[PDB]
Write a protein that binds this ligand. Sequence first.
Ligand SMILES: [Ca+2]
Ligand SMILES: [Ca+2]
Ligand SMILES: [Mg+2]
Lengths: 119, 362, 119
Amino acid sequence: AMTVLSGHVVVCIFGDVSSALIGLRNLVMPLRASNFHYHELKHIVFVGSIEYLKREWETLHNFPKVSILPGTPLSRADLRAVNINLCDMCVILSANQNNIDDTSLQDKECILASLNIKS
Amino acid sequence: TLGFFIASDAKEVKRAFFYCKACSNVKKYDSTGMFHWCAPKEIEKVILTRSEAAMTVLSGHVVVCIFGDVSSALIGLRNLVMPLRASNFHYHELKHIVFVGSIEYLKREWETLHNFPKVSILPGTPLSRADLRAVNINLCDMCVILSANQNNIDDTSLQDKECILASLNIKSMQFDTTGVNIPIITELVNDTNVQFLDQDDDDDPDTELYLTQPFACGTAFAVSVLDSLMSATYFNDNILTLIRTLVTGGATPELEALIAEENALRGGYSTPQTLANRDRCRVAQLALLDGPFADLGDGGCYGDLFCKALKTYNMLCFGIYRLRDAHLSTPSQCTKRYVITNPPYEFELVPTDLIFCLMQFD
Amino acid sequence: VSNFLKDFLHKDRDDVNVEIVFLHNISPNLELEALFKRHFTQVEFYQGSVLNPHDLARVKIESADACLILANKYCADPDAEDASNIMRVISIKNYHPKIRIITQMLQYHNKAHLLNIPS
Ligand SMILES: [Ca+2]
Ligand SMILES: [Ca+2]
Ligand SMILES: [Mg+2]
């Protein structure tokens, strides 16, 4: 809440200890290309469970402007804290895209998070 | 204006509009002023051991027995604690709440309860008779038996095994009196298990839940009786909001906005309109043996009590918590009382009797 | 049932004359029916559930001398069948409290739960 973030990228993640790794280095690396100046970079904040980010952080840990808020994408308080109205893009991914067997609510979390920001 | 009524029919309440006779900086409440609120405690500040619970005398309190685990689903105990922390009670009129159960399940749930004044936790077992003696179960105002394992057991024979065993365990204890008079409420899953809660009733598997004895005396409550609320909410959409004010202690949609944003009851600073929120009424019971209308129980009429209490004290009266054997010839010792809702004007009034009533907050 | 009828109807007792009524929800196979025909005057079977009080009324549990609850001593979960047999004691004492119940428990704490029953 203290750090003002404008023109930044908020990556909401519905992860867990058991879910497969997304491979977030392939998301961060095109946003850290050297044809941008260091002031022209975009700050990246990951909103999700800290356990899943703990499993993945050893590939992201050499990049300049990465932050992590260990919360929930559905919690409206955390999205207000990261100034979601001022971001340049909000990216909603889910690592539970392969282990759910309901075939009715695989995209339940992503649709709920999208409508939560839309309201 | 809309009048919420209680009558036997709908063409009876058609006469409700067919009438002419012609033709000081401390945070003592929440941010809204509806509940009480205290500083966010740490879980060790409320955990008591068995000797610590034995030292603290608890009378007129509420004991919530919980059969929980690490894996069981969350009950949502904030919806139980919040109507017992409404601001139309004084701080001395609150009831102490002690949770008897596994500390793991309470650890999973305590981050919603941790802003309430008089909550305690004894990490034990509801079936252990030692812990129930330590919390003075004979002196409590209500013992509530819930189970979070109401959804994951697949036996369909012993889903309500723990709750029935805990109910009979309290019903067989003895003190220096017997524990058959302790007021217990147990939540059931399969309604056919309601026959095991009492001994003297005549059980039958084909009787519905509303006609059984331990439901009619208000000692059992299954969620299947709330199935009628869908049609009740459709035909009159103000009924559900009337319930949620009556039941959750006046949950206005301002707190719904607050829990939509922060999902946490936050304390506030005392304003005069915050104190204007406290003027909600309170449901309570009344003993018909010593009060200002104690003389009326000489086989009198109930409607005389209704007009007198409403004129004097501005207090409504739903009905009668009549003893089960108060109409019988021989005097028994059964302290079980059943519920009569909206008795007529000429209803006889036994002296040993309790009255459901809505009390103002003066 | 074979081991029970050996030890119960043994000739080393006196001239016993009690009848043995059985009560089980599963229907017996052909070998149990041949066993009940071998004991045609001493043993009667009635299919029902001990939890359902109509079936307790069918076997005349109000005038029975005692009620015996055999346990499956090689069950996979001992607390589960101790729970089930405790439920059977609750059901019979719910119908008629003045009956003599003999039962088998597999642990000692589940035996301790039986004394808490008010009958
Ligand atoms: Ca009616
Ligand atoms: Ca009964
Ligand atoms: Mg015969």
